[PDB]
From a paper:
A successful example of this approach is the allosteric protein [name] which is a molecular switch created by recombining the nonhomologous genes encoding [name] and [name]-1 β-lactamase and subjecting the resulting library to evolutionary pressure. As a consequence, the [name] gene confers a maltose-dependent ampicillin resistance to [name] cells. Intriguingly, [name] activity was serendipitously found to be negatively regulated by Zn2+ at low µM concentrations in a non-competitive and reversible mode, a characteristic that neither parent protein [name] nor [name]-1 possesses. The structure reveals that the [name]-1 and [name] domains are in close proximity to each other connected via two linkers and a bridging Zn2+ ion.
Two types of crystals of [name] were grown in the presence of high zinc concentration (2.5 mM). These crystals belonged to space groups P1 and C2 and were refined to 2.30 and 2.29Å resolution, respectively. Superpositioning of the [name] molecule from the C2 space group onto each of two molecules in the P1 space group yields r.m.s.d.’s of 1.7 Å (619 residues) and 1.6 Å (615 residues) for molecules A and B, respectively. The orientation between [name]’s [name]-1 and [name] domains in the C2 space group is somewhat different compared to that in the P1 space group. When superimposing the [name]-1 domains of the [name] structures, the [name] domain orientation between the two different space group structures is different by about 8.5°: the [name] domain appears to pivot across the [name]-1 surface with [name] residues furthest from the [name]-1 domain shifted more compared to the [name] residues closest to the [name]-1 domain likely a consequence of the bridging Zn2+ and linkers restrictions. Similarly, there are two zinc ions present in the C2 space group structure of [name]. The main Zn2+ ion in the C2 [name] structure bridges the [name]-1 and [name] domains via residues H468 (H112, [name]-1 residue numbering shown in italics and brackets from here on forward), residue E477 (E121), and both oxygens of residue D164 ([name] residue). The (other) non inter-domain bridging Zn2+ ion makes liganding interactions with residues H509 (H153) and H514 (H158) of the [name]-1 domain (in C2 space group).
Residue numbers in the entry: 1 to 316, 328 to 582, 585 to 637
């Protein structure tokens, strides 16, 4: 059935098939094997048909989502690359091509929508979705519009719908639960409501599809569009002075686009599995291989770290203190605490220094922790910032201090107290005294400075779960106060810590007053060693349940990713949108998702159905 002795490749017409062919000639010269590149019609639908009969191409290129439907039947082969190669790619790209611990494909490129804006019409793009209506009113006066994108398809509309808590299918442990769908939740409804209101207020049109949006932006008629790298060439051709940036926020939370991982899967019926893995590992997944493909058709962002760093260069309220659990894709094994002080340093300077300590930590991981170089970088941090730095690196399992610097001096906790706060919250949940979905209502007066999520939920309210997430990940100050009120205030948090053996850490004040940090003021302070030990008691033992531990870990993970610690260690517009987005579920049940959600959006857009009933009907359709 399948030719013995040569490689046949199936890649889509929109992708750089001619660029992959040049890599095919680079392999042909070195080995002496005829590399064929074919682009047939409906290749993602033809592959289930051909591979089932013991036939088909050796290597298939497609987004990872359909690849789950091949691993179920048995059409894809297991992938065995060494860590010497698995390190060269991003840790999340592999988790997109995993089915039951197995590896079914090599990740090549990452696809995610981004905000594209005309620099001539709009030099400074909006940071939030909420400011777009008033910006559209500004631009209509000049015969232009603010934003035009494909409203017909769920994929283009999802980033906004999912932003405030929407999801396709729940991912827990590793398996996607086909019964837990989040297209019906309050977050999804708020998201769709905003879109519908944009349509109702005539900032957008219900008829706008892919070609109407693309032509309107490329002709300079609209200031913004929403698209992926597959559209970049048409804009280059159009000669519009354009930038690509992070999608706007909605209710203080990032837009949540679907993440496609263009992947190269090896056919299970193929007799050339080893011959294909050589071409993919040693030829394609190199700087030179990706170069040829990216030249033919821009891939956007790539799976190979060395080449993404090069592409990221293309021109087209922070943390004084930090707390992090590292080695996280598997159970975290280390706690890091760092505090910076003084009124001299800018946040960019603070962030730069924290990143350098982070970069130093990852460099010497698995070496046993506490490498002399990292202590040098910490001392260098105190130096450059012109004020005391506190630091501790702790092994989560042993409780052993791997490194310390000013471990027993007091430092203002500031935003780091919020993890301890939500630790107390989850403790009341475990006991039956609290529910993560209990909604809390509040007024304008409750709002303090630096409250990006809470200030957009005045009419809606917020669940305890949303408050903890906003407090930790978005550092929402009002959120922390509202959570403090639930447990009884700063004295109760202090009482909670003393009851679990931490007699150092103290919270005395509310937000924003707890942030002021008067020199040597002992209010709202901790020690690096106190904080790390307390964090350890919360993340090990029986102080929280497994479910609560995992949730505390998951809040901290998003905080660590959004923060400075990992910036210089593992650093694009496509990539940054993908990092805050949703990995597209690799199940055939996704077909039911696409059908129902498309119907829901066109019905809510037209006024055929209300937003509530349109998404209820969609939810019913999925879980049927
Ligand atoms: Zn919300
Ligand atoms: Zn005490």
């Amino acid at each position: 059935k399948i030719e013995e002795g040569k490689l046949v490749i199936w890649i889509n017409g929109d992708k750089g098939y001619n660029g992959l062919a040049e890599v095919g000639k680079k392999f042909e010269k070195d080995t002496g094997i005829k590399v064929t590149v074919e682009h047939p019609d409906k290749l993602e639908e033809k592959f289930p048909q051909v591979a089932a009969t013991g036939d088909g191409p050796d290597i298939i290129f497609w987004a990872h989502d359909r690849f789950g439907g091949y691993a179920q039947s048995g059409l894809l082969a297991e992938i065995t690359p060494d860590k010497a190669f698995q390190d060269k790619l991003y840790p999340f790209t592999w988790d997109a091509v995993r089915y039951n611990g197995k590896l079914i494909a090599y990740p090549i490129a990452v696809e995610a929508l981004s905000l594209i804006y005309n620099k001539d019409l709009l030099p400074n793009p909006p940071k939030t979705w909420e400011e777009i209506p008033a910006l559209d009113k500004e631009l209509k006066a000049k015969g232009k519009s603010a934003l035009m994108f494909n409203l017909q398809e769920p994929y283009f509309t999802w980033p906004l719908i999912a932003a405030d808590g929407g999801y396709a299918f729940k991912y827990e442990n590793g398996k996607y639960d086909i019964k837990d769908v989040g297209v019906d939740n309050a977050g999804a409804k708020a998201g769709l409501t905003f879109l519908v209101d944009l349509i109702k207020n005539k900032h957008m049109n219900a008829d706008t599809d892919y070609s109407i949006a693309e032509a309107a932006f490329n002709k300079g008629e609209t200031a913004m569009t929403i698209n992926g790298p597959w559209a970049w060439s048409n804009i280059d051709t159009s000669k519009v002075n354009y930038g690509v940036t992070v999608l706007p926020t909605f209710k203080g939370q990032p837009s949540k686009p679907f993440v496609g991982v263009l992947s190269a899967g090896i056919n299970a019926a193929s007799p050339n599995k080893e011959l294909a893995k050589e071409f993919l590992e040693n030829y394609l997944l190199t700087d030179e291989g990706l170069e040829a493909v990216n030249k033919d058709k821009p891939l956007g962002a790539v799976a190979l770290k060395s080449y993404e760093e090069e592409l990221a260069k293309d021109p087209r309220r922070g943390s004084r203190g930090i707390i992090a659990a590292l080695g996280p894709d598997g159970k975290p094994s280390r706690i890091v605490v760092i505090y910076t002080t003084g009124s001299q340093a800018t946040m960019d300077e603070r962030n730069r220094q924290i990143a350098e300590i982070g970069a130093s930590l990852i460099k010497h991981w698995g070496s046993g922790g506490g490498h002399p170089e990292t202590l040098v970088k910490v001392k260098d941090a105190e130096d450059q910032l012109g004020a005391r730095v506190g630091y501790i690196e702790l092994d989560l399992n042993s409780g052993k201090i791997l490194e310390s610097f000013r471990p027993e001096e007091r430092f203002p906790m500031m935003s780091t107290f919020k993890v301890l706060l939500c630790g107390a919250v989850l403790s009341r949940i475990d006991a039956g005294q609290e529910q993560l979905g209990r909604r809390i209502h509040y007024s304008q007066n409750d709002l303090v400075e630096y409250s990006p999520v809470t200030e957009k939920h005045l009419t809606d309210g917020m669940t305890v779960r949303e408050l903890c997430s906003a407090a930790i990940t978005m550092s929402d100050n009002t959120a922390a106060n509202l959570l403090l009120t639930t447990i009884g205030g700063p004295k109760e948090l202090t009482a909670f810590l003393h009851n679990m053996g931490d007699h150092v850490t103290r919270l005395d004040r509310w937000e924003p007053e707890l942030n002021e940090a008067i020199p040597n003021d002992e209010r709202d302070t901790t020690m690096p060693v106190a904080m790390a030990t307390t964090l350890r008691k919360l993340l090990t033992g029986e102080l929280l349940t497994l479910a609560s531990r995992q949730q505390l870990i998951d809040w901290m993970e998003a905080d660590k990713v959004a923060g400075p610690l990992l910036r210089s260690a593992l650093p694009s517009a496509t990539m940054e949108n993908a990092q805050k987005g949703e990995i597209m579920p690799n199940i055939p049940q996704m077909s039911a998702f696409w059908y129902a959600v498309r119907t829901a959006v066109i019905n809510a857009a037209s006024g055929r159905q209300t937003v509530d009933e349109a998404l209820k009907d969609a939810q019913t359709r999925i879980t049927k």
